[PDB]
Amino acid sequence: APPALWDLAADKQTLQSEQPLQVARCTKIINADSEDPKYIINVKQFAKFVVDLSDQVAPTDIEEGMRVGVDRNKYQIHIPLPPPT
Amino acid sequence: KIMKSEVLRVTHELQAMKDKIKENSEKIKVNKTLPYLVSNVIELLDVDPQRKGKCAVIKTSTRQTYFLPVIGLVDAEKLKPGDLVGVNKDSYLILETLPTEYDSRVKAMEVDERPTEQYSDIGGLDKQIQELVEAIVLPMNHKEKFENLGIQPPKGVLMYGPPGTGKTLLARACAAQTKATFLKLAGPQLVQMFIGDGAKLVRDAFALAKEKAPSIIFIDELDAIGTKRFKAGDREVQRTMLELLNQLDGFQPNTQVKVIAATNRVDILDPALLRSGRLDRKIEFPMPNEEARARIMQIHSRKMNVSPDVNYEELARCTDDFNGAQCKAVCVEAGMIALRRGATELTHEDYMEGILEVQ
Amino acid sequence: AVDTAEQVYISSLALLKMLKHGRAGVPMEVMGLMLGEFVDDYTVRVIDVFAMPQSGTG
């Protein structure tokens, strides 16, 4: 509770900050890329998806089979992420 | 010209059509923007008794089957049982069909754009390699003359001979001159643990050759799997192999990308490999003599600082019953110990030193 | 800083247009616009209602 006190008082801006960063499509990994606009992606649920690249992620930062964050509403790639033992 | 004055109204109606197609043709970009998932398509012709019968069977990636007729734009290569088709959110229509070929272990077998070596790296083989250089240059640039003369290039060339002759690096050296996409394939790659894999590998090879741009597919070690046994694994390689021969015998539209093959031995010669589309070009490539080995070793060693006092008689005598890649290994070995010999200039004892070193 | 008790008047025009628009209410997101006149603060009346063409964005 003492650790949750200062963070509980710091939880006010979490409501105005809840609208961003909300995007999570189960971190689906891509397979390949036929052309630069359209990217073939495969989710862990054995469902292959295709979406265009967003303007916030450069095309040179895309790697074959890379786990990156992706929207579940616009389906676009908002921000990537760096991550066996 | 009073009767021809009504054409102006027709041209005004046509240019008005070109002025009004911008909106309904403009919504194509916002309706056909992005297919969000991938769904498998299976063709199944239906009958309605216009009222014409036409339908197809759909299968989504999430294992859900729906119903929809054959719809979309003008289709030429479509209507095949393939994957990676265009589909909107929930109406489940077909908008953009593109072939998929996941199984990247076979798709990305050998992704090579172009090699470095060229045909000018060997010496003394133009009398037998010139037919292949023609047989790869003239079918790539002279397609126009193929209609005046009615010529269809062969699709199966048998590049056979003893091993170690560098036939792989030489066919690749000609593949640099083909300028097309180079795609290797190994004989022992067809023998897999699971059943029916060879069909997926062969139909995959003709999937990238048939679907993709004009390329070059050179295979090697075909004799290691071309055994005509009379259970047995080589009879499974007779299922896959005779399947490939059925795809080189029963397919008249096979006028597309050639299939180059090379066998390191002709002991077990399959008699069914004789056909216009099959391995008809049988140019014998024997073991190069000491003269030809000194030629390919001279052109392959024209970059190192070789001493000018080379009469080729000592190396011509030491090289007895050798091959091309063996003298290439002598050149590379000489380029390996010539560094640690202190003298930056290649000496004459390094030839026999390498020959007796690696052999 | 003031608030009243508003109530939306719904005639059969907007109702039947939302019923035909509900028949055309495919899973794809649809758009529409309501019209009317503002006579006072706490009443609102709708008369004209039409549909909008669908789009891939929704």
Task: Reconstruct the topology from this structure.
This is part of a larger assembly, with chains A (85 residues), B (359 residues) and C (58 residues).
Chain A: H1 3-9, H2 13-16, E1 29-32, E2 38-42, E3 48-52
Antiparallel strand pairs in A: 1-2, 2-3
Chain B: H1 7-24, H2 27-31, E1 39-43, E2 56-60, E3 65-68, H3 104-107, H4 126-141, H5 145-149, E4 156-160, H6 167-178, E5 181-186, H7 197-211, E6 215-220, H8 233-247, E7 259-263, E8 279-282, H9 290-300, H10 313-318, H11 324-340, H12 349-358
Parallel strand pairs in B: 4-7, 4-8, 5-6, 6-7
Antiparallel strand pairs in B: 1-2, 2-3
Chain C: E1 7-9, H1 12-23, E2 31-37, E3 43-52
Parallel strand pairs in C: 1-3
Antiparallel strand pairs in C: 2-3
Category from helices, strands and their pairing of chain C: alpha+beta
Coarse shape of chain A? elongated
Quantity of strands of chain C, as a count? 3
Main sheet specs of chain A = 3 strands, antiparallel
Oligomerization state: part of a larger assembly
Largest sheet of chain C: 3 strands, mixed
**Structural class designation of chain A:** alpha+beta
Order of SSEs of chain A, N→C? Answer: HHEEE
Strand arrangement within the widest β-sheet of chain A reads: 1-2-3
Radius of gyration of chain C: 14 Å
Query: What's the shape of chain C?
Result: elongated
Strand content of chain C: 25-35%
Count of DSSP-assigned helices of chain A = 2
> Order of strands across the widest beta sheet of chain C?
1-3-2
- Strand segment tally of chain A: 3
> Ends of chain C: how far apart?
35 Å
Number of helices of chain C: 1
Helix residue percentage of chain C: 10-25%
Rg over CA atoms of chain A: 16 Å
The helix/strand order of chain C is: EHEE
Subcellular location (chain A): Cytoplasm
Modified residues (N6-acetyllysine) (chain A): 44
Organism (chain A): Homo sapiens (Human)
Family (chain A): Belongs to the AAA ATPase family.
